[PDB]
Amino acid sequence: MKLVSRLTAKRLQWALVYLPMLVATVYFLVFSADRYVSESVITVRQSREDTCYLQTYIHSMGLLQKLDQQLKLREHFGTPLRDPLFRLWGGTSQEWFLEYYRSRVEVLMDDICGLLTVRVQGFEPEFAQALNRAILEESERFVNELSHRMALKSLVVVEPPVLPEIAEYPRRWYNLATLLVVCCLIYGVVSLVVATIRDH
Amino acid sequence: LTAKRLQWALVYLPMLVATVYFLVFSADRYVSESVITVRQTASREDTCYLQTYIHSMGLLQKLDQQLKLREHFGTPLRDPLFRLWGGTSQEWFLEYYRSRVEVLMDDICGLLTVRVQGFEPEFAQALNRAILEESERFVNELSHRMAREARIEATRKLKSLVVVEPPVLPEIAEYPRRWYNLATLLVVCCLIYGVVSLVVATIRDH
Amino acid sequence: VSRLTAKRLQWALVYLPMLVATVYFLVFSADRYVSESVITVRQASREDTCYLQTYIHSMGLLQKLDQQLKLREHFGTPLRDPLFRLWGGTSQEWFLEYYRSRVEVLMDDICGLLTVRVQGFEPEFAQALNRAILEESERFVNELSHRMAREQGQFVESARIEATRKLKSLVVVEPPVLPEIAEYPRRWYNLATLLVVCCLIYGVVSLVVATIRDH
Amino acid sequence: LVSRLTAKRLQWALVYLPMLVATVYFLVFSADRYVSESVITVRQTSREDTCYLQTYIHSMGLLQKLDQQLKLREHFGTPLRDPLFRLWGGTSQEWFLEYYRSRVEVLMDDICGLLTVRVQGFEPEFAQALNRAILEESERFVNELSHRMAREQGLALAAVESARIEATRKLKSLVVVEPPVLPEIAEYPRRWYNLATLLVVCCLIYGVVSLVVATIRDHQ
Amino acid sequence: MKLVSRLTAKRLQWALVYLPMLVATVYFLVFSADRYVSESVITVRQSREDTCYLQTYIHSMGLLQKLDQQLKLREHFGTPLRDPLFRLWGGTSQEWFLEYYRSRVEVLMDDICGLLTVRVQGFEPEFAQALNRAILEESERFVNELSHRMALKSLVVVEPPVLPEIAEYPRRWYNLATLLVVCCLIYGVVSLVVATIRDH
Amino acid sequence: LTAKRLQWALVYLPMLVATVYFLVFSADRYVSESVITVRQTASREDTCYLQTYIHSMGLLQKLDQQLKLREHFGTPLRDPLFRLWGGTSQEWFLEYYRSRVEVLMDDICGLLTVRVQGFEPEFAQALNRAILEESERFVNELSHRMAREARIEATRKLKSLVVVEPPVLPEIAEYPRRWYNLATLLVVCCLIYGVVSLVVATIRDH
Amino acid sequence: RSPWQIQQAVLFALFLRELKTRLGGRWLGVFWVLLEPVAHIAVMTTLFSLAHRAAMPSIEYPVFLITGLIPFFMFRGLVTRLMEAIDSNRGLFAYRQVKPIDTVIARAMLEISLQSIVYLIALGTLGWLGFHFLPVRALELAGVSAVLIMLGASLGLFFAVVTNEIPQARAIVRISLLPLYFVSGVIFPVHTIPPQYLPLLQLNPVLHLIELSRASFFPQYRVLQGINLAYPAGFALLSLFLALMLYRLRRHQLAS
């Protein structure tokens, strides 16, 4: 209780507002690395089961090994030495590689059309487009092989993968603004609670 | 004589024994994961049969004859909680096997995912592969028995097992995720401490 | 007379039933092994599975199983367990109730699979009873279909090719297993339930005896 | 006159009088009622036919046929020591129908569409015979109901042949899941369960009445 | 205010409890007339539309005119001179005749079988059975005529009309008991209202 | 100056004028009721077309040409509220006709019931019969126009009107049920009196 | 001065006391106690009419909904106003010849009279609209209503005696009453819900009472299995005995 009243205001102000924003601004404006995004929109036709299998297959492990053999994802993702958070550190485990890859490619599907959209992140736009194209080709080969193994069907590409011009995901200003909102709310709640415990 | 003594006991002592068990005594278990489904040549009944059959006793006997799961699961002497003790009952062995092999249905898309634990990654992969092969044999054998009541139909491949993701070979063990369990146990013990303190204050007030 | 209820009332009404139940469940109880099987009916299958679910607990099946395996002489063996054993001279209705208690049928609506758990005083007898139940159920669905087809066709090629075939078959997902440790009875769960109900009864009579003692 | 009601009178009347009456009636005067149970359903070669059977089991025409066949009025009047569950002589037809509907219980299972018929009699053989007669008459009624339309139906010779085969064919036959059982002991007169339940209920009622009386008295 | 002060309990008791019991007992035990009931259970088969048409047709006016021509319902229902409430007074209107007839025959329908049950009341059991039989025959002729007019189907009688032995509808003891319950409740409520307005 | 004066006005005066109108001035209107449906040789569309068509304007013009409804509905000089005044608009005439003819659908069983009012029972029966005949002609004429886009189909009786209950000839007039309206008006005027008195007490309290 | 006479006098006094408090000061409480049912009538008719038509084509929605809603309103009113009776007139026990049980039963009879008036008014306005209002079997309906009233009053008295010197319990029982609106199946017929959750829902006594009241009120109403009156009757009797016993034990401590 002696230290409970010692948090005062300025110490709480510093350690809950200004230091986190100092490190956040330092990381975003200097340490961060750009992450270009390639977006594609595909479906499977001769059938929600088929695009369900495809959605499971995109984030699978066998596809990850095939893509690592083809384009060497592990070598590419370890290049941004400046960013320590969003780079793939060398000598990491296979499971962490799978989790990192699943974070990098986002797969989405609308329920009222069955359209499956994929967004692939990469530190170079050409690599992102190549990864998206390889994903699409492997998906087409997979559904054709699954049809053939039983003994017909082809992928429809509504929107082929784009070649991005500028990166879009490491948004620095929007992240700083939502950090402002969250930090202020956390301050307000914890300051009210420290006031009522100190008054007791 | 509750005072702070009951707080000290009910908070520190389970936390202390859990930490000294997880940080030293616990043995990590590798996991092999595969995703399959059953297609013809409706299809949900075959996957329901597979979900029931994977956690059965006859399949456990077949897998014990094949890979000797009983001798494998008794290997780690260091871990006394997750080790299958020698000379146990068949019912306890079945419950242990059902705990070490987790099968999940996804309601849409008709997908059955099997996650098999083991103290070696190669053993986990081999066990998952054996489970998949025996499941395919079982769904074929049901239709063979159906058609053996003629001889042309009873020899074909009436049902095929579609493997969306084959079993993988883990590099590191996901379980027992010691930090998550320690945090969960700390939170729940804090909750029990709070409710016990409230009821003890109520009792001693009277 | 009323000035004789005290802590001794708690003593008797709580610990005497606890001691009696603990003594009975620790030494006097008889082990009951359980054999489990999982089956379904296939060439409308829901109708046949419901027919089987009703037929397992029927009296005709019980009489057939008595004639085949002598359930009366087996269930009357544990003379040291007067509560869970079947006494001699027990009527047919009480015998049917005992058999219905000793055989549990679980229906699952999603997969449409029927689970049968059979309790016996010996590990081999439970599996034998489960096998006999399965065989009799398959014979029952076959006999029902054959009787319907024959009574229709006794009035021609279709009738005589449908009255002798095997239209209904039993799909055994899990065959009857042979246990080696008795699943039943659950001594600790039963003791906990009896403790809870004894505590509730004691509380009720304690408040009643506090009320009447108020002049 | 609240003070007119004492503890002794309340005890005596409210507890002992109904308990003594029920004990005497259940242990001295009551008569055994064996019950025979059968489980059936009707199959072609649906739900409509089995619910028609459910309606028809309690119908008056079936009661007349069964009374002609087995003399239900004579059998249901034999137990003279039991005046509550016996068929008194010289009773109206409506009361006879109500008594028959009380003695025969029909339960419908809609998850499977199975009809359970439980027939009460004062002898196990009579209960089994009544259940068998009910099953036979229900099958005959379903058959006749199916046959009537085809019988009223009757190139032209083809139509005549179709009408005669449709009228002569055995279309709907009910399958039996559990045939009627000959009971060994009576199960419906539950003397001890009823006596214990009535004792508990009377004790609770006396406690409530005594507490209300004491609360009323506490106004001085 | 002065008239509600003039009022007391005893006049309220006599005007709400004993007088209704006197008139009800006098009517039921002396003035009432027995009404025998014949019950039939029928359906139509080659179909909820067909039995819906039948249910509408039973209570129709054309069927009433046909039955009046056949069995002379108006002459039969005017016989019980002792009962003034449930008899058909001579020289009454056609609409009141239809309402009386619709009250006399009760048609019920279950939702899960489609079975249509009819209960016909009459002051003589043979007349009640004859009226039920005539209703059934006219219904069969009506559905057959409706089928033929378009240019097939026949009625199924699960339970033919019974011949009643004793009347069942003019229940006297049950009616007296429920009248007692209703009268006691009404008296209690109105006495509470009288007490609370008098105190004001 | 509300006092009891507003009570006296708002209770007695509408009650007085309603009683003096219903008991003397009102003229009773006989009603002919029929119940029909449409069947082939799905069928709900023909009945819904009939429901829309009976309350239309072209059918009203046809019936005015046939039976001269305008001269009939202006007959009772005694009643000034339910009489069709001479020289009125066509729109008001259509609203009056829609008020004097009621068409009810029953959702199940597909039955359309028509109740036609009139100051004479024979006129009400004749109007209902004419409505039924014109409705049958209309449902036939729609299919005739459909098939006249061949000549074999466009002359048959493609649709038939099933008449469950033909129009009846009333003996007495059901409407205007004066006692029911008087009781309803008394109840509603009592309610308005209560709310107005309470709001006036609230206003005068301030 | 017989105890019954002074008890009746104080009950009439306490009764009109609760009346003045519950009803509006301008004689307006009838307006809101008639507005509460009609809003629920309107919203449930505009939200579930076609669902009821798909349920059964035999009974129209307004009468079927009223005949279950008004007894449920009586039950919830009995519980709510009964449990708050003792901790609302703490300044009234200063005079002798008064007891908390007098206050709770005065509130009970006031609630019973108000809901009976509302029920009669609803039946009258239902019969004025051409619907069916006359009960086919009124004696069984009266018995079921009496059992429901006794159960509600007993539960209210039990909650009044037990939760003295802890108002916070009165805060949570309200949130226990909101799901009971949908659990009891008053709005929609219970014949539509699948049996997979029936055995858990058969432990609600008010469910059995509502279905039995509807069966005794309507002609040819199908009652499903396990809706016997024995279970709610035993529940009400046991709860009433327990509540009266608990009041008798904590008698002098209650009044302070």
Side-chain angles (χ1 to χ4, degrees), chain B residues 31-176:
Chain B
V31 165
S32 157
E33 161 179 27
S34 91
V35 174
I36 65 181
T37 182
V38 188
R39 302 312 284 168
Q40 204 37 63
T41 71
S43 64
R44 57 222 83 177
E45 84 191 346
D46 275 300
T47 52
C48 282
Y49 297 171
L50 274 205
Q51 196 174 1
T52 306
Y53 176 70
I54 282 163
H55 278 163
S56 76
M57 182 76 247
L59 177 90
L60 180 52
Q61 294 193 335
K62 262 184 269 292
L63 294 178
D64 210 314
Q65 258 153 54
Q66 228 175 306
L67 327 165
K68 312 163 291 272
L69 315 156
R70 203 191 266 279
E71 82 166 71
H72 174 93
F73 282 144
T75 283
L77 291 317
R78 210 66 168 147
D79 203 353
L81 185 55
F82 290 108
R83 182 195 66 217
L84 185 77
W85 291 66
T88 38
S89 45
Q90 147 181 308
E91 275 66 33
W92 169 245
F93 176 48
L94 176 56
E95 297 307 315
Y96 185 85
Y97 158 78
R98 284 185 185 155
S99 158
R100 296 284 87 77
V101 169
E102 161 196 10
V103 54
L104 317 154
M105 206 39 158
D106 155 48
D107 227 346
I108 308 104
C109 326
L111 275 183
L112 196 89
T113 172
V114 191
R115 284 152 57 79
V116 156
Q117 306 184 17
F119 294 107
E120 310 296 328
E122 304 92 357
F123 185 80
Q125 163 154 51
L127 181 47
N128 207 226
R129 261 203 281 255
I131 286 175
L132 291 202
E133 203 268 347
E134 218 48 69
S135 301
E136 159 202 349
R137 166 140 62 248
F138 164 82
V139 292
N140 263 353
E141 161 49 356
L142 260 46
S143 300
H144 291 356
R145 283 183 206 141
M146 202 56 29
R148 234 184 272 136
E149 38 86 19
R151 64 222 161 280
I152 318 100
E153 158 172 0
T155 65
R156 315 201 326 278
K157 286 274 306 270
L158 318 99
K159 268 137 204 300
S160 55
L161 191 89
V162 152
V163 182
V164 163
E165 164 176 9
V168 313
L169 187 41
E171 272 210 4
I172 51 134
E174 169 170 347
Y175 293 90

Side-chain angles (χ1 to χ4, degrees), chain D residues 113-130:
Chain D
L114 275 172
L115 263 201
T116 308
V117 195
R118 334 195 53 208
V119 177
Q120 306 177 29
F122 297 106
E123 300 138 11
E125 310 93 25
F126 190 89
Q128 170 147 84
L130 194 38

